[PDB]
Amino acid sequence: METYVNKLHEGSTYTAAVQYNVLEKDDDPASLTIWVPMFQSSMPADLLIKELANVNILVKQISTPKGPSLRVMINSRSAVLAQMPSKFTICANVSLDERSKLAYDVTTPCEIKACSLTCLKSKNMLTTVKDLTMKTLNPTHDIIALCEFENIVTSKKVIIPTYLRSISVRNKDLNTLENITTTEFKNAITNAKIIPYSGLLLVITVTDNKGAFKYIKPQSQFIVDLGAYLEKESIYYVTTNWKHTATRFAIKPME
Amino acid sequence: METYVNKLHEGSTYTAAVQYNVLEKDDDPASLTIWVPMFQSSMPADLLIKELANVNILVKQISTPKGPSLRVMINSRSAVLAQMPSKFTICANVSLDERSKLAYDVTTPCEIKACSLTCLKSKNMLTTVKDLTMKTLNPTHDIIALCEFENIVTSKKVIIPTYLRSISVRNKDLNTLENITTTEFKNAITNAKIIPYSGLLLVITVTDNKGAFKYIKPQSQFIVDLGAYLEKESIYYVTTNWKHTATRFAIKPME
Ligand SMILES: [K+]
Ligand SMILES: [K+]
Incomplete structure (x- = not known):
């Protein structure tokens, strides 16, 4: 085995x-x-x-x-x-x-x-997507993680976009987004891990509570389900053959 | 079209x-x-x-x-x-x-x-599965509808088992089940319709409120989703090619 x-x-x-x-x-x-x-x-x-x-x-x-x-x-x-x-x-x-x-x-x-x-981490240091839906007021933007894989058999690239949270963004912060997509946030996305759980599970280490990480407990692991995107896949095939190659993000005005 | x-x-x-x-x-x-x-x-x-x-x-x-x-x-x-x-x-x-x-x-x-x-029927005469989960006390049995189809292209038979509700059954009623699977209930299952909505939708006409129909408004349409069972299918293919041939039921002791 x-x-x-x-x-x-x-x-x-x-x-x-x-x-x-x-x-x-x-x-x-x-x-x-x-x-x-x-x-x-x-x-x-x-x-x-x-x-x-x-x-x-x-x-x-x-x-x-x-x-x-x-x-x-x-x-x-x-x-x-x-x-x-x-x-x-x-x-x-x-x-x-x-x-x-x-x-x-x-x-x-x-x-x-x-x-x-x-x-x-211990359960008290884990943050879910559901946890954060209760932590915003008239949000303006959605934050999406763009999980990139290469299928190592076919060489095809696969992107799974996963919802993280919605937030409200000040107009003045939009010029550079630096108070939202902080250095801390950017590095945490870049270095995020995807592991074999719930089909696949995205794990983002939350290194502080500013900007896109507001109202999250510092040093939490923010865990995100990808399995909903794998319904039509074989999970064993995916965890054997989909190599996680990058994680990017998008901050989208809400609809 | x-x-x-x-x-x-x-x-x-x-x-x-x-x-x-x-x-x-x-x-x-x-x-x-x-x-x-x-x-x-x-x-x-x-x-x-x-x-x-x-x-x-x-x-x-x-x-x-x-x-x-x-x-x-x-x-x-x-x-x-x-x-x-x-x-x-x-x-x-x-x-x-x-x-x-x-x-x-x-x-x-x-x-x-x-x-x-x-x-x-009008919305006030429609009953859902969720409606009925709030209508039982320490249930003993699950009621499942067995929706039978023939694929008219391949001739293959398909059964979709769909959960209806849980109920409590008296020991004495088990001898024949006649106070639970009443004549009314049996005929309503036999004559149930499956139509193209929510993928597929099972529609049971509730002709009274006894037995398996207890706590349902009489003359309601009890509507049940099958679309969760069609995730890996093409719904257009299904509503073109799956002929509904029968509806049966099972009353299962709960696990
Ligand atoms: K699957
Ligand atoms: K489908």
Whole structure:
């Protein structure tokens, strides 16, 4: 099994962000990716990944008010994985590969092809997009991150534009935008990481609270979902073959 | 242009449920389907469809907290279509066909290939799945509608299972289920309609409020989204080629 460890946060207690790529144990197997609800651990990541790799996964496709969902079961957990959610539900459209299909309401064993563990800061130092929608007043502009990938098989470039937040900008600040797209903000976008979680997850390190980072807790990790953009993709194919090559941004007047 | 009128409700004032299948005006065109927020009209449907067919549609793909979305603009509206939403946003993953792609933030004219108008009861006589999630106490069972289609090109059968509601069932009622899956309920499922809206929309006529229909307003239309199940399909292909052949149900103990 292929394993991946990315120590974005290098403190002893951290938030584990775990994603498995799996394959139905059957002829004509469905292929799908499962991300586990975040949980805190204190076992060093290079040891925790060995435990994560040894679990057994079963899935069941079900119908919910939101549409098709996958019920996930994780067992064969070792003692440290008491820490880890073992029953939970994820979106089937994101999780399942293009052309991959599961019968409904049948508990289905899956073989693990790969396991990725990303270490993030503690939950109180994580900021979401939803968190920030409650932090603006009559905004004037949208901030979008432009996530650039190269498909290493085809050489094709791919841009995924992901919404970050809306803000209000003073007219005088528009001349250079320097009070909004501060040096801190620009460097944080340039150096942002995209890792295998929620399909893909953009992680921006918020180094202070000025301008485009206003009302964010300093030294937070601002995490952003890309999986909604991967519904029609195979997530395992994407995390194997889409090389993250750059992150840019756009500040757009709102519509 | 192909047009479709389904008079499910045959009163003079009705809720118009309108869906357009369109094609980007370009070489290598994207194909997509747009459904319009429901609105009330009193123009007879066989006349309103002529006005609906004459509109002009433009779309713009944008990024939002929920992922990729399509901003829709409708103009070339005649006087009666003052009644109709002319600017609104829908989910891009449902709307856009498999393998169909739009550049971001570019307002894009679309040619209308087909227009469907379905007449539903007035908004106060429509019941949603969300409405009913607030109408049960420690439920014991889920009710699922099993929507059966035949693909008329390939002859393949397709079942879309859609969640309706959860309910609590008395132990004594389980012997025959007759107090839950009443004669009224059974006939309403058998005779349910699926029409081109929200991708596809299941419409169940609620003929009374007993058993599986408890806490629903009598003579309501219980409307259920199938579009979440069509993300990886082409909606125009589906409404042209998936013939609705039956509707069944399952009452499942909850998990
Ligand atoms: K997918
Ligand atoms: K679709």
